[PDB]
Structure formats: C-alpha cells, structure tokens
C-alpha cells in the first residue's frame, strides 16, 4: 500500500543516496506519482548531479549556474507541504550543499537535526552522522567564527567513527587554512596510503609536501590530477583551474630556492587557467605577482591586479592604491580603499596595516 511503501522508503537508510534501488523508485512513482517524497525522489533521479541514468533504466524497464528550476520548485513545494520527513530533509540538504548553498541550508539542517532528535527520543546513527557531516561542512565553509566548533565536531566524529575520510579531509582543510601544516602532512599521507586514487587527495598531499621540505615529486603529484579530470561541468572546469593555480604556485615556490624557465612555465599554466576560466581571480593575482616581481613590468601588473580586484584581495588592492596615490589621484585611491574596507573580506589584514584609513582621511582632507 501507500503507507507501507512510504514507511519503507523513510526507514530504508542509505549510506549514499546514489545506491538506492532506482527501478524501485520508478515502480513507486508509477504507482503513486502524487506523493511529495515520490516526486522529490523523481527530481533527485532526474538531476544531472546524481549517479542514476533514467533514460537507460526506462529503456531497460556555456553559462555559469548549476541549480535546476524543476528540482528547486518541486523541493520547495515538498518542504512547504510536509514539514516532517527525514528523507526529504536529507535530499534537500544534499542538493543545497552540492549546489554551493551553505547559508540557505542552515535553517533546513536545523529542522533536520530537530527531526533526528525527535526520532532519537522516539536509532540508526547512519543518518545522524551524515547530517552532522553536512552541518560541519556548512560551518566550515560559511563561517572564522564557527571554525573551532566545526573542528570540535570533526574531532568528535573521528573519535566516534574513525571510518570516514571526509572528516579527515575536512580537518585537513581546516588545518591548511589556519597555516597548521604539521598535522596536515600526516593526515594527507595517511589518506593517500588508504587510497592513492582520489585526485583531490593527491592534490592536497602534493600541496602540503611542497609548502615545506619535499618539492621533487610535489609538482608531479598534480600531473595525475590534471590529466585525469576529463571533465566538462562547471565544477570540473573550476577544479581544473584550481589545480593549474596550485601547480603554478608550488612551481614558483620551488623556483624560489638567472633561471627563467620556471617563470615561463608558471606563466603558461596561469594563462591556460585564465583562458579556461575567464573569471579566476587568483590567476590574475598570481600573474600580477609574477609581473611585478620578476619581469619588472608596470602596466601589465597593474592591469592584472585591477582585473583581480574587480572580480574579487589585500595585495591587489594595495598595489592599485599605491599606484593611484603616487600620481597622485586621491579620489580613485579613496574609492579603492573604501571598497576594501566596506567589503569586510580582509578584516584580518586590516588589524595590522592602517593605510586604508589614512588614505580615506587624506582624500577627505584634500
């Protein structure tokens, strides 16, 4: 009946939603297309993000943007109608964080944790662990205010499970962003030993190795990452751009310790990344860094930094403000400094350097 199938679907816990019996979903949707959970599952299957292939099953039975109108509309309708469904909340949260929707997913993750607490008070931890991972990722990405809470959650997850590499890589990310690499090398080496196949895992391992000590195979580590992508999605494109930027960065880092082949190679890699991305601000930032430091050119570095700052950035803003202030042109320098201050994306570097406030004050004085 409808009730039995609904209860079975709600109680059938999946380690990953992609392993669900897709022909069973087809059968249930054919039987009861009106069920909100049924249409949510149908939208999940129809989404390009899932591992399912609806066309093959039925036969057997460039712009920037990722979300789908039909899926968003159906999920919004279902969440407005039901207000209580573990599977619906899980699917909605998964779609949120996969569509790079962290802030919008916070109330829904809160509702899901409330529902899981309801179920606990009324006890498979397979769904609770997934929801905790989702909340920890939301804390890590959206918020340096909730970083410590996410780190504590990762520590608890690793202590209680010690079987998920996602928590390990999240803790590695938190350690990397806080310049705490000593544990990062150990964690990345352990993960790579567990499975030396994840391209991103090899990317972070080579990154951490290159940042101190070993630089020989650090460059070659990303080679198997860049060569093995063969991707066409927006996520694939930006991942390739990120890998190219990482290889260029570690490459000039190794070049730090007359020779110009290294600079030329990094220039070529960054040019390729900018060509394949056309909005990749770190590429312009690194190009401006190279132009200012090594090639000793003025206009090219200024243009690269201007593009990087317009797209995004302390160093680019400082370079442009110094270029304006030396002309002098205090209105444009005031505009750049005021934009940097109001952005609130560089408040950490503004607690030690006081040139933006001085620039704004001087421009008012003039």
């Amino acid at each position: 009946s409808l009730l039995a199938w609904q209860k079975y679907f709600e109680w059938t816990d999946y380690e990953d939603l992609d392993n669900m019996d897709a022909p069973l979903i087809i059968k249930y949707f054919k039987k009861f297309p009106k069920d909100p959970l049924a249409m949510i599952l149908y939208s999940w299957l129809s989404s390009k993000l899932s591992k399912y292939d609806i066309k093959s099953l039925e036969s057997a039975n460039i712009e920037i943007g990722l979300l789908e109108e039909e899926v968003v509309t159906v999920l919004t309708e279902n969440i407005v109608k039901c207000k209580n469904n573990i599977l619906a909340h899980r699917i909605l949260c998964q779609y949120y964080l996969l569509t790079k929707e962290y802030e919008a997913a916070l109330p829904y993750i809160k509702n899901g944790i409330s529902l899981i607490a309801y179920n606990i008070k009324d006890h498979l931890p397979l769904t609770k662990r997934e929801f905790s991972l989702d909340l920890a990722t939301v804390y890590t990405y959206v918020d340096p205010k909730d970083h410590n809470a996410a780190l504590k959650l990762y520590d608890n997850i690793l202590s209680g499970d010690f079987s998920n590499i996602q928590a390990k890589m999240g803790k590695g990310i938190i350690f990397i962003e806080r310049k705490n690499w000593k544990d990062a090398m150990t964690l990345l080496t352990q993960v790579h030993e567990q499975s030396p196949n994840n391209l991103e895992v090899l990317s972070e391992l080579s990154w951490s190795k290159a940042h101190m000590g070993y630089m020989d195979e650090a460059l070659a580590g990303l080679d198997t990452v860049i060569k093995g992508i063969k991707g066409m999605d927006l996520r694939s494109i930006d991942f390739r751009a990120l890998n190219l930027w990482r290889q260029a960065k570690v490459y000039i880092m190794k070049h730090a310790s007359a020779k110009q082949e290294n600079v030329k190679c990094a220039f070529k890699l960054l040019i390729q990344s900018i060509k394949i991305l056309d909005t990749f601000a770190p590429g312009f930032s690194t190009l401006g860094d190279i132009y200012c430091h090594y090639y000793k050119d003025h206009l090219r570095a200024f243009k690269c930094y201007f593009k990087a700052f317009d797209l995004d950035d302390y160093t680019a803003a400082k370079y442009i403000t110094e270029t304006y202030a030396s002309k002098p042109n205090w209105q444009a320098a005031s505009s750049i400094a005021s934009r940097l201050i109001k952005g609130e994306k560089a408040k950490a570097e503004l607690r030690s350097n006081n040139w933006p406030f001085r620039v704004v004050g001087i421009a008012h004085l003039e």
Binding site: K264, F267, K268, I271, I274, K275, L287, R300, K303, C304, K307
Partner: peptide
C-alpha cells in the same frame, strides 16, 4: 612576445 600578446588579448 607570445606570452605578452596572449595576455593583452585576454584583457584590455
């Protein structure tokens, strides 16, 4: 150079 040319062709 080819590099500078490509850079100029990608921007203003």
């Amino acid at each position: 150079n080819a590099d500078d040319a490509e850079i100029d062709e990608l921007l203003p």
